[PDB]
Amino acid sequence: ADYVLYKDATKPVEDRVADLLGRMTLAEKIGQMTQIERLVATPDVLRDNFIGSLLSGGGSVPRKGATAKEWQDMVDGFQKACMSTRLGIPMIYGIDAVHGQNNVYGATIFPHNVGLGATRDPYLVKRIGEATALEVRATGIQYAFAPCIAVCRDPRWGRCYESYSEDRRIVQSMTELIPGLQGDVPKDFTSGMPFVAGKNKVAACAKHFVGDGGTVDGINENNTIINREGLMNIHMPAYKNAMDKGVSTVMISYSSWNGVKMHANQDLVTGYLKDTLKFKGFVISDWEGIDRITTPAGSDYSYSVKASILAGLDMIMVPNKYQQFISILTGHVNGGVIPMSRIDDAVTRILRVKFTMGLFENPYADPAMAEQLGKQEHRDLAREAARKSLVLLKNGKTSTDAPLLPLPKKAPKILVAGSHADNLGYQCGGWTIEFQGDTGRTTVGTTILEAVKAAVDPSTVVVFAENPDAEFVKSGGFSYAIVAVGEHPYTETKGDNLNLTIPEPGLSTVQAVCGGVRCATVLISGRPVVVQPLLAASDALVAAWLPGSEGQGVTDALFGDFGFTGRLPRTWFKSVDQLPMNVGDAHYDPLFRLGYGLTTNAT
């Protein structure tokens, strides 16, 4: 009697989309296009404004320490409001699950993308995508703002750790995260269509379109000083591979191409991504991306709305001032400035993702999935990934020396030292707990010190000293030392030291330690950093990047349970005065070339 085609799960997605679109008011349409922060959401807001999507920005959590069920209850409360509208269109909830479900207490934290590039293992990255989707679904969230497929062309960029590599081929290969997060696409799949397999997978997001990784100094306020190819060659290809793997959404960059803000760039968003690549999912803004079309940002929000929607963006991450957005856009459509065809295209795309992913069939969280969060099998995977990410840069001071690594697990006494030896926040880096990352024990995990204590023979005495002086080392009777130092957590605009030198004490600790006993230096960083003084001091040196919560991945290689296999995914500069300097540069003069890495064999 009361049949409604869009609510019929047996019907084809396109039919469901069209049936629903055809019923919607303009307010219902513009609501779909609006994404708001949970911090501004209430049930009445969500219902009254027919809101399409919610997000947690970095650090936007229901409480410090919240359990998976607490996250599920939050998301469900929001969903129940949305399902109570006239049409009952479920909202999609997005979050930066960029190295695991990293805003959430107790989530597995995977290595950041630069370390994953070092692994040269696209199947590992697929499996990480699979584990990440389960952990995101543990918390009731259906949508992850990953992968970042930036090709970072200058390591001074404060997001360079979110790029798999300066080499776009490695970036292309690591687009295998997408079918991990979303499921593998059907055999006969059409490139550009969105895909999510169902309730145990999440929608993905290739970001930030396009050229976010491009120069100038290093990348980071910009711009892309490059030209067409440049584009087509360096910054664009991985978006094609994302289309081939059915990425559901694409997020637009704050940056500009050829002097046109990407958030206003009709030629690339509509002409290229939609009309040439045949992208059929939805295009989302970045956070206040549209505001930033103007200078200063936010100084003509009317124009920001007009320019971004006519450029072809589908959903706007407002994320706070929803009233202004909805009002202005309504005014533009009522005025004829933005045609209903454009609104209908936006809403078609949003609904196509939602129907395709099963959201109308499973709008609510699965309580049985809660135990996926921090699940030990996922931690085992993260440990594998961290170990594979490590690049051995030095293993002996001279060609006559015994290799230091692998270290013996049995020794009378050993020293673990350095600012980064017992600091889980530093080992995870940015985008962890959140947004900027943080220091100390911010989540469940294993520091380098705890990993050493868990590895060594019971007879081995392990002594920790954060910053020991030279005498302490010389008098301790140590067999060897593991010293861990490096970068503090950061991002694009915060904590990003463009001299690329590690904070002190870091070098001074390595010098004090290595001056007294054979040492293995573990460098924790988002990128290559000035290294020669650390190399000169150290017997062995390992670039561990930002390995995440599973510090036993580091000890697994240090003590020879597995061999070192990681290879540099970036060029290691001799000097910052060289930069930018990437593989293929005219004057390519690296300290270590892209692909460099020493190996060991398992003991």
Which residue lies nearer to ligand 6BV by CB, 38 or 518? Answer: 38
Which residue lies nearer to ligand 6BV by CB, 288 or 539? Answer: 288
State the nearest-atom distance from the C-beta of 247 to ligand 6BV, in Å. Answer: 14
Could you give the string, one character per residue 15-54, with x where binding to ligand 6BV holds by CB under 6 A and - elsewhere? ----------------------------------------
State the nearest-atom distance from the C-beta of 317 to ligand 6BV, in Å. Answer: 6
The correct pick among 28, 70, 96, 450 for binding ligand 6BV (CB under 6 A) is 96
Which residue lies nearer to ligand 6BV by CB, 304 or 447? Answer: 304
The answer to the question of residue 438 lying near ligand 6BV (CB under 6 A) is no
- Residue 544 parent element (H or E): strand 540-545
Which residue lies nearer to ligand 6BV by CB, 53 or 423? Answer: 53
Distance CA(100)–CA(550), nearest Å, equals 12
R_g over Cα of the chain = 25
- For residue 492, indicate whether it is catalytic: yes
The answer to the question of residue 157 lying near ligand 6BV (CB under 6 A) is no
Which residue lies nearer to ligand 6BV by CB, 58 or 445? Answer: 58
The answer to the question of residue 143 lying near ligand 6BV (CB under 6 A) is no
**Pair of tokens at residue 284:** 């989302």
The answer to the question of residue 325 lying near ligand 6BV (CB under 6 A) is no
State the nearest-atom distance from the C-beta of 422 to ligand 6BV, in Å. Answer: 28
Which residue lies nearer to ligand 6BV by CB, 57 or 516? Answer: 57
Could you give the string, one character per residue 186-225, with x where binding to ligand 6BV holds by CB under 6 A and - elsewhere? ---------------------x------------------
- For residue 14, indicate whether it is catalytic: no
3-state SS, one letter per residue, for 357-377: CCCCCCCCCCHHHHHHCCCHH
For helices 301-311 and 322-334, the axis angle rounded to 10 degrees is 70
The correct pick among 31, 57, 218, 281 for binding ligand 6BV (CB under 6 A) is 57
State the nearest-atom distance from the C-beta of 8 to ligand 6BV, in Å. Answer: 34
The answer to the question of residue 100 lying near ligand 6BV (CB under 6 A) is no
State the nearest-atom distance from the C-beta of 207 to ligand 6BV, in Å. Answer: 6
- Please state the separation of Cα 99 from the chain's center in Å: 5
Q: How many helices (H) and strands (E) does the chain have?
A: 20, 16
The correct pick among 58, 140, 418, 597 for binding ligand 6BV (CB under 6 A) is 58
**Pair of tokens at residue 105:** 């207490």
Residue 148 is which amino acid?
C
What is the side-by-side order of every strand in the sheet holding 249-252? 205-209, 249-252, 282-284
The answer to the question of residue 281 lying near ligand 6BV (CB under 6 A) is no
Residue 576 is which amino acid?
V
| Residue in 14, 184, 244, 492 annotated catalytic | 492
Which residue lies nearer to ligand 6BV by CB, 250 or 465? Answer: 250
Distance CA(573)–CA(49), nearest Å, equals 52
Residue 390 in contact with residue 543, Cβ under 8 Å? yes
# of chain residues touching ligand 6BV (CB under 6 A)? 8
Handedness of CA 439, 442, 447, 449 (dihedral sign): positive
The answer to the question of residue 166 lying near ligand 6BV (CB under 6 A) is no
The answer to the question of residue 286 lying near ligand 6BV (CB under 6 A) is yes
State the nearest-atom distance from the C-beta of 48 to ligand 6BV, in Å. Answer: 24
- Please state the separation of Cα 196 from the chain's center in Å: 19
Of 278, 291, 285, nearest in space to 313 by CA: 285
Distance CA(473)–CA(513), nearest Å, equals 6
Which residue lies nearer to ligand 6BV by CB, 223 or 565? Answer: 223
Pairing label, strands 34-37, 53-56: parallel
Which residue lies nearer to ligand 6BV by CB, 255 or 509? Answer: 255
The correct pick among 50, 78, 105, 287 for binding ligand 6BV (CB under 6 A) is 287
The correct pick among 435, 478, 490, 592 for binding ligand 6BV (CB under 6 A) is 435
SS3 content of the chain, % helix, strand, coil (to 5): 35, 10, 50
Which residues ranging from 521 to 580 are in contact with ligand 6BV (CB under 6 A)?
none
SS3 564: coil
B/e letters for 515-537, b = 16+ CB within 10 Å, e = fewer, are ebbbbbbbbbbbbbbbbeebbeb
Distance CA(557)–CA(559), nearest Å, equals 5
| Residue in 176, 286, 438, 539 annotated catalytic | 286
The answer to the question of residue 145 lying near ligand 6BV (CB under 6 A) is yes
Handedness of CA 497, 498, 502, 505 (dihedral sign): negative
State the nearest-atom distance from the C-beta of 58 to ligand 6BV, in Å. Answer: 4
Pairing label, strands 282-284, 260-261: unpaired
Q: Which residues pair with 54 in a beta bridge?
A: 36, 93
Give the CA angle between residues 470, 474, 479 to the nearest 5°: 125
Q: Which residues pair with 521 in a beta bridge?
A: 483, 541
Instruction: Show which residues are catalytic.
Output: 286, 492
Q: Which residues bind ligand 6BV (CB under 6 A)?
A: 57-58, 96, 145, 207, 286-287, 435
